[PDB]
Symmetry: C2
Subunit: 89 residues, 2 copies
């Protein structure tokens, strides 16, 4: 089963121009940590979200553009649950 954390990671990596180092510092976590969770996700899905050239991301794949876009929808809907909660709070 895919996890929300891996969805947040590919969204953030995509919004830091594929710079995994810059993303790690954005999320206050280690850079190897983010790379692990993404490859678990890609192994779990069986598709590459990010094309690589060595230990380095080069571009978002066709499949990844669709998957990341939908991850943003999931992350925004998770946020709306917390806003629904707080309005009734």
């Amino acid at each position: 089963s895919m996890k929300l954390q891996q969805l947040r990671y590919i969204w953030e990596v995509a919004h830091h121009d594929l710079n995994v180092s810059a993303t790690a510092q954005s999320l206050y976590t280690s850079q190897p940590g983010i790379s692990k969770q993404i490859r678990l996700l890609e192994d779990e899905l069986g598709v590459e979200v990010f094309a690589r050239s060595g230990k380095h991301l080069t571009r978002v794949t066709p499949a990844g553009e669709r998957i990341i876009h939908t991850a943003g929808e999931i992350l925004r809907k998770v946020e709306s649950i917390k806003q629904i909660a707080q309005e009734f709070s």
Copy 2:
């Protein structure tokens, strides 16, 4: 942080007419496991998804109707990701 599992649980509990026992057997898990994950979710959200009367769920709350609906959209969108993966495999 909220988890996909807890979103799957409140949705499944809601589609087994609030019967946690039938839901546990559906998901091949324990009934205490589902209850535990639901109360964690509700503590994080600070709202009750299910109105209670003793060790018993009576109805879905105004807020819970919205949260469960949005949890369903999320669970559907998680499925769209794996359908995107399968296509591109």
